[PDB]
């Protein structure tokens, strides 16, 4: 296995358990809470993407 | 301090967490990388939020 391979395979993991524990510590909180969250992460989830449009 | 913004606190706390984890990941790989995955994950944000917006 290269260091690019083992790379790939860890950020995959890495990024599939962030989104496991995210979803599971949202279905924690009412519905109205969830919306709320929900919004505000999307709207961070787009400046955190045009960040990155501009470093590259 | 009420259960709430215990609740409020700690939510605010992960997502800080979380946040920072994943940049400094990021910053580890080359910039075609990070550009690749970015456009990922950007793609997967607007998926969950259309399926936050369903259920709400």
Same mark, same amino acid.
């Given at each position: 296995?290269?260091?690019? $391979?083992?790379?790939?395979?860890?950020? +995959?993991?890495?990024?599939? %358990?962030?989104?496991?524990?995210?979803? /599971?510590?949202?279905? $924690?909180?009412?519905?109205?809470?969830? +919306?709320?969250?929900?919004? %505000?992460?999307?709207?961070?989830?787009? /400046?955190?993407?045009?960040?990155?449009?501009?470093?590259?």
């Amino acid at each position: 296995m290269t260091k690019q $391979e083992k790379t790939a395979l860890n950020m +995959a993991r890495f990024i599939r %358990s962030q989104t496991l524990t995210l979803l /599971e510590k949202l279905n $924690e909180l009412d519905p109205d809470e969830q +919306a709320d969250i929900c919004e %505000s992460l999307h709207d961070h989830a787009d /400046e955190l993407y045009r960040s990155c449009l501009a470093r590259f």
